[PDB]
Design a protein around this nucleic acid. Structure first.
Ligand SMILES: Nc1ncnc2c1ncn2[C@H]1C[C@H](O)[C@@H](COP(=O)(O)OP(=O)(O)OP(=O)(O)O)O1
Ligand SMILES: [Mg+2]
Ligand SMILES: [Mg+2]
Lengths: 545, 412
RNA sequence: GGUCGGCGCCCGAACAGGGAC
DNA sequence: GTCCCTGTTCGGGCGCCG
C-alpha cells in the first residue's frame, strides 16, 4: 500500500497562504483518465475526498508515459511552489555508464508508482487540493487532497530520494558488497555472486522494499543483458547510447536548431569529433523560438560531418580501477576541442567536447588549459580521480607559456602526443629592447563627445604618421597606434606606448579576438621577427607620447 | 548536563546555502569513514532535504600527516555569525605573540566536540557527503556539538580553554598563548630546546585535561620585509630610464616625496630605446634623493582594528612570489617575498596555495585576523586545484585579479 | 496546449570590484 | 560621467534522466 516511513515535516514561506487557482478546462479523454485514477487512489489510501472547509485549489492534468498506454496525473503546483519553503536537493548529478565497474551479475528494478507510495506531511496535505470535473460542463465534480507526494510539487523529488535512501540503508548495511545505483526510483543492482545467490539477494531486496510500501513490478530486467538504463543499453562488456535521431529540416526554425544542438550534445558523450560551433552560431541574435533562420554554408558542412559521424557505430567500455585513466585531446579549429577518455587504446570509456569561449581575446594554450580543467572535473565526478593527459602541445611550448605568464597556471601530469594541429604560441615578445631596430613612440586618443580620434606614431629616425578616426574610443585609438607602428616597421621593432590596456591585451600573446583590430595586430605580430613592447607613463613628455 | 550558548545569526541574514563540489574518491572514502564514526558518537546526525541549508565539505592532510582530517568550508556561515564571534564572544589577540622569538602551532580542534551545540543553531551547520558517479543522492548531516572550522566554536570553548591552561600559564607566565579557530599559538623567547620541551609539556597538560593533538615552529622575527628597490648601473639606456621613471611614478603613490622631473627631461626627444644617455647632474641628485626616500618607512601608516586586511600576491617567476598586506590602498602594513616553496619551478598552483597559507598564518600572529586575498589566477584554474594542496584547517576569503605587470615594482 | 527536481550545453540581462581617460 | 578588464547572480531555451 503506502509506506510506513515517517513523514517529512514540510512548511510554507512565512506570511504566505495556500493556492487559489481554478482548473484548466480539459479534454474529456483526460477527464475520464483522471476519474479512473482518483477513484483508484481513493480506494488505496493515496487520495482523500475533501469537504467544503478546504478553501484552496490548484489545476491538474495528465501526460502519457513513454512507449506506454498508462497516464501520469500531474498537478500544476507552480503557485504553491512559489509559496513553499526552500529545500536542499540531494540529487547532485547523473550516473554515467563509463563509471560502472564490471559486475558478474546485474539486475535493474523500477519502483511502481514511486511517489504515491510515500506519505505526505499530514499538516501540509490541506494545500494539495485539486478539483476534477465529472464532465467538462455537466457536473460540479468531486475534489480531493493528496496523502502522498504529488507529481508537480517542488518538494517531491528530494523527499522521495531521501526516503529511498532511508529505506535502502538497512539492507545496504547488511550487504556491503552489493552495489546499488539509486537514481530516483531506478535501482540498478550489481554483484559478484553467481546468478543463483544473486537472484536470492534480489528477492530479499524486493521483499524489503515491499515491507516499506514499495513495489517492484515485473518490469525488472532479469539478469538478461542488454539492460536499458539512464538512456543507455548495458551489454556485459560494453554500453551504448540509445538511438539518437537528429532533426531533419528543409527549413530550420530556431526551435529546431536548439533541438539539434541539444541532441548533438547528448551524442558527443561517446561519438568522437562532434562539432557545433557553426550551428550554434546562428542562435546569437535570435528572438522567437519560431523564428526561421537560413543555414549558412559552413553550418551546413558541420551538420553533414556530424551526420556521418553518427553513422559509423560506437560503444564505450566500463571502468577498470586497476588501470590508469588517459585523456587525449585534439584541436578542431575555431576554439573547438574534443577528447576521448580511455584506459586501453582504441577503447573509449567516453568522449566529449569543449568549445566554450571566455573573454574577448584568447589563445590556444589558454583554451587547452580550460579543456583540461573541464575534463579533470568531469573525471572526478565520474571516477573520483584525475586522468593522465595526452596533449598536442610540445613540452617546451608549455614551459615557455606557464613560466612567463604573470598569472598562476598549471596542467597535471601529461605527455606530448604528436597529433596535428599542434598547439603553439604564434609570436613572442622580447624581454629586452632590440639594438639596431627602429623605435616607435605611438599614441592615440579620441573625443568622448564627438567620438573622433587620432592614431599615430613618431620614430627615432623621423618616421611619422597621424591618422584621423571616425566613431571610435580611447581604447580603439590605442590599439590603432600600435597597429600602425607594426604595419610601417621592418621585421624587428621597438614600440613604446602609454596604453596599459593595449599592452595588457598584447602581452597575453593572443591568437584570437572578438575584435578585428586585435586580429589585425596579431597578423602583424606573427609576421615580425622581433617585437619589443614597453610602457611609459603619459603627461611627462616622453618622446612623442 | 552542559548548557548550550544560544546563537543567532546577524539580523537580516539567512543561513548558508552553498553547493557541495565534486570530491576525489580518497576524500569521499575518508569522509564516509569519519562521518560514520562521528554519528556513532553523537557528534553529528542525519537530516533531510527540508533543512534548506548547506556548507561544502572536504578533507585534507596537514603537513607531513598521512592522517585525513575533515574540513568544512564555513566561510559563509562565519561571515553570517560575525557579531556573534567577533563582538559578543570575541577572543582577545595578544600584541606580544608576534614579538616572541619562537611560535609553535598546535591543533586542538578535537576538544570542541566535548561541548553541545545550541539546538536552534544546529540546522545551520548542515553538509552533504557526495558519491562517486552520483551512485547515491548526497548524504546530509548536521552538527550536534561545536564544529571544527566555525568561528563560533573557539568563541564558546574559550571559557573551558582558559580554565584548562590556567595552571601551565601560572607556571610559565612569560609564554604567550593565543587561540585562533582550531589552533593554539604558543610563543616564547626561550632558546629552541627549552621551547620545544615546553611545547611537549603543554601537550601533556592538554592530554590529561581531556583533549588530544594530531615542526610547526614559527619565527616571526625572520619574516622578511620586501621593499621597493631601484636598479644601480654605470650606464643607462633610454629604456632603463623609461623603466626607472615608470617605477618611480608608481612608487610616488606610496611615497609622496618622490619626483621624476629631472629624470623625465632625459627622455624628451624620441631616441632609440637602446641608446646610452649620460645622467645629468640634476637627475643623479633626484635619483639619490629617491633611493633615500625608498629607504625610509611610509608616513602615517597604522593598523586600524576596525577594518579588514587585504593581501595581494604577485607571481615574479622563477619560484619567486611577492606580497603586500594593507587596509587602505598604498598604506602597506607589511610587504614580503617567498622563494623556493614546495612546487617551485613545476607547479604555480601549489606554490600560490603555500603563499596564501604562509601569509594567512603571519596575519593571524600579527593581527589576529585573516586577510582577504587578491589572487593572480583565473578562477577556474584555482578552483580546480586548490583543495589538492590545502594543508590548513581554516580557509581565508579570496577574489581573482589579472594585473599584467607593466612596471616591475616589488621585484628588481 | 500545461508540473517538478538534477545534470549538460547555449543565450541574456542586471549587480559588485578594478583600472583608463 | 563614457569605455573595458576581473567576478558574482539571477532569468530564459534545448537535450538527457526520473
Ligand atoms: N514528468 C514528471 N513530472 C514530475 N514527476 C515525475 C515526472 N516523471 C517522473 N516523475 C517522478 C514521479 C514518479 O513517481 C517517479 C518515478 O518515475 P517513473 O518510474 O517514471 O513513474 P512511476 O514510478 O510513478 O510509475 P511507474 O510504476 O510506471 O514507473 O519520478
Ligand atoms: Mg516507477
Ligand atoms: Mg523509474
Amino acid at each position: 500500500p503506502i509506506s510506513p516511513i515517517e513523514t517529512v515535516p514540510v512548511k510554507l514561506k512565512p506570511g504566505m497562504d495556500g493556492p487559489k487557482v481554478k482548473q484548466w478546462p480539459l479534454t474529456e479523454e483526460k477527464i475520464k483518465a483522471l476519474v479512473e485514477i482518483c477513484t483508484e487512489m481513493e480506494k488505496e489510501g493515496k487520495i482523500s475526498k475533501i469537504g467544503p472547509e478546504n478553501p484552496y485549489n490548484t489545476p491538474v492534468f495528465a501526460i502519457k508515459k513513454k512507449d506506454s498506454t498508462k497516464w501520469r496525473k500531474l498537478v500544476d503546483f507552480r503557485e504553491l511552489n512559489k509559496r513553499t519553503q526552500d529545500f536542499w536537493e540531494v540529487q547532485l548529478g547523473i550516473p554515467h555508464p563509463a563509471g560502472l565497474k564490471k559486475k558478474k551479475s546485474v539486475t535493474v528494478l523500477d519502483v511502481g508508482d514511486a511517489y504515491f507510495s510515500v506519505p505526505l506531511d499530514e499538516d501540509f496535505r490541506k494545500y494539495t487540493a485539486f478539483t476534477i470535473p465529472s464532465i467538462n460542463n455537466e457536473t460540479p465534480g468531486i475534489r480531493y487532497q493528496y496523502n502522498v507526494l504529488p507529481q508537480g510539487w517542488k518538494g517531491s523529488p528530494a523527499i522521495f530520494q531521501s526516503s529511498m535512501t532511508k529505506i535502502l540503508e538497512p539492507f545496504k548495511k547488511q550487504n556491503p558488497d552489493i552495489v546499488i545505483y539509486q537514481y530516483m526510483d531506478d535501482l540498478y543492482v550489481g554483484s559478484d555472486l553467481e546468478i543463483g545467490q544473486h537472484r536470492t539477494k534480489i528477492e530479499e531486496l524486493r521483499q524489503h522494499l515491499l515491507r516499506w510500501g514499495l513495489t517492484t513490478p515485473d518490469k525488472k530486467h532479469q539478469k538478461e543483458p542488454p539492460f536499458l538504463w539512464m538512456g543507455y543499453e548495458l551489454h556485459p562488456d560494453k554500453w551504448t547510447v540509445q538511438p539518437i535521431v537528429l532533426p531533419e529540416k528543409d527549413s530550420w526554425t530556431v526551435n529546431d536548431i536548439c533541438k539539434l544542438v541539444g541532441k548533438l550534445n547528448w551524442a558527443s558523450q561517446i561519438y568522437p569529433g562532434i562539432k557545433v560551433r557553426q550551428l550554434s552560431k546562428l542562435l546569437r541574435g535570435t528572438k522567437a523560438l519560431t523564428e526561421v533562420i537560413p543555414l549558412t554554408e559552413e553550418a551546413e558542412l558541420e551538420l553533414a560531418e556530424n551526420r556521418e559521424i553518427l553513422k559509423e557505430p560506437v560503444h564505450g567500455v566500463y571502468y577498470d580501477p586497476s588501470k590508469d585513466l588517459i585523456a587525449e585531446i585534439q584541436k578542431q579549429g575555431q576554439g573547438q576541442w574534443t577528447y576521448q577518455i580511455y584506459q586501453e587504446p582504441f577503447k573509449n570509456l567516453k568522449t566529449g567536447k569543449y568549445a566554450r569561449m571566455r573573454g574577448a581575446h584568447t589563445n590556444d594554450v589558454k583554451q587547452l588549459t580550460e579543456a583540461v580543467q573541464k575534463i579533470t572535473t568531469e573525471s572526478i565526478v565520474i571516477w573520483g580521480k584525475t586522468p593522465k593527459f595526452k596533449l598536442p602541445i610540445q613540452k617546451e611550448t608549455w614551459e615557455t607559456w606557464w613560466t612567463e605568464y604573470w598569472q598562476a597556471t598549471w596542467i597535471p601530469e601529461w605527455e606530448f602526443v604528436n597529433t596535428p594541429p599542434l598547439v603553439k604560441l604564434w609570436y613572442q615578445l622580447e624581454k629586452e629592447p632590440i639594438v639596431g631596430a627602429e623605435t616607435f613612440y605611438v599614441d592615440g586618443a579620441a573625443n568622448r563627445e564627438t567620438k573622433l580620434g587620432k592614431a599615430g606614431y613618431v620614430t627615432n629616425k623621423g618616421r611619422q604618421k597621424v591618422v584621423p578616426l571616425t566613431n571610435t574610443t580611447n581604447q580603439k585609438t590605442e590599439l590603432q597606434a600600435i597597429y600602425l607602428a607594426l604595419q610601417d616597421s621592418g621585421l624587428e621593432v621597438n614600440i613604446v606606448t602609454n596604453s596599459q590596456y593595449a599592452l595588457g591585451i598584447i602581452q597575453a600573446q593572443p591568437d584570437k579576438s572578438e575584435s578585428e583590430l586585435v586580429n589585425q595586430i596579431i597578423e602583424q605580430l606573427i609576421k615580425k621577427e622581433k617585437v619589443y613592447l614597453a610602457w611609459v607613463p603619459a603627461h611627462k613628455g616622453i618622446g612623442g607620447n | 548536563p552542559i548548557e548550550t550558548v544560544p546563537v543567532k545569526l546577524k539580523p537580516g541574514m539567512d543561513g548558508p546555502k552553498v553547493k557541495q563540489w565534486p570530491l576525489t574518491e580518497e576524500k569521499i572514502k575518508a569522509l564516509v569513514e569519519i562521518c560514520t564514526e562521528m554519528e556513532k558518537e553523537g557528534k553529528i546526525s542525519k537530516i533531510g532535504p527540508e533543512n534548506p541549508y548547506n556548507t561544502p565539505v572536504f578533507a585534507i592532510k596537514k603537513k607531513d600527516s598521512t592522517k585525513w582530517r575533515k574540513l568544512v568550508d564555513f566561510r559563509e556561515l562565519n561571515k553570517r555569525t560575525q557579531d556573534f564571534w567577533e563582538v559578543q564572544l570575541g577572543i582577545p589577540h595578544p600584541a606580544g605573540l608576534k614579538k616572541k622569538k619562537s611560535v609553535t602551532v598546535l591543533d586542538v580542534g578535537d576538544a570542541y566536540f566535548s561541548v553541545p551545540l545550541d539546538e536552534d543553531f544546529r540546522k545551520y551547520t548542515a553538509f552533504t557527503i557526495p558519491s562517486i558517479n552520483n551512485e547515491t543522492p548526497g548524504i546530509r548531516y548536521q552538527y550536534n556539538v561545536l564544529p571544527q572550522g566555525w568561528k563560533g566554536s573557539p568563541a564558546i570553548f574559550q571559557s573551558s580553554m582558559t580554565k584548562i591552561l590556567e595552571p601551565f600559564k601560572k607556571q610559565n607566565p612569560d609564554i604567550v598563548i593565543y587561540q585562533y579557530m582550531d589552533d593554539l599559538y604558543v610563543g616564547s623567547d626561550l632558546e629552541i630546546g627549552q621551547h620545544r620541551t615546553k611545547i611537549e609539556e603543554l601537550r601533556q597538560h592538554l592530554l590529561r585535561w581531556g583533549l588530544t593533538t594530531p615542526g610547526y615552529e614559527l619565527h616571526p622575527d625572520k619574516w622578511t620585509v620586501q621593499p621597493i628597490v631601484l636598479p644601480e648601473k654605470d650606464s643607462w639606456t633610454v629604456n632603463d630610464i623609461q623603466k626607472l621613471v615608470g617605477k618611480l611614478n608608481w612608487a610616488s603613490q606610496i611615497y609622496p616625496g618622490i619626483k621624476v622631473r629631472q629624470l623625465s627631461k632625459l627622455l624628451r626627444g624620441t631616441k632609440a630605446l637602446t641608446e646610452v644617455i649620460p645622467l645629468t647632474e640634476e637627475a643623479e641628485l633626484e635619483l639619490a634623493e629617491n633611493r633615500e626616500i625608498l629607504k625610509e618607512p611610509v608616513h602615517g601608516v597604522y593598523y586600524d582594528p576596525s577594518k579588514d586586511l587585504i593581501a595581494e600576491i604577485q607571481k615574479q617567476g622563477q619560484g619567486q612570489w611577492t606580497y603586500q598586506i594593507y587596509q587602505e590602498p598604498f598604506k602597506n602594513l607589511k610587504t614580503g617575498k617567498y622563494a623556493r616553496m614546495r612546487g617551485a619551478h613545476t607547479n604555480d598552483v601549489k606554490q600560490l596555495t603555500e603563499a596564501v597559507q604562509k601569509i594567512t598564518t603571519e596575519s593571524i600572529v600579527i593581527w589576529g585576523k585573516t586577510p582577504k586575498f587578491k589572487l593572480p589566477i583565473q578562477k577556474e584554474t584555482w578552483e580546480t586545484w586548490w583543495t589538492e594542496y590545502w594543508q590548513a584547517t581554516w580557509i581565508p576569503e579570496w577574489e581573482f585579479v589579472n594585473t599584467p605587470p607593466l612596471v616591475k615594482l616589488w621585484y628588481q
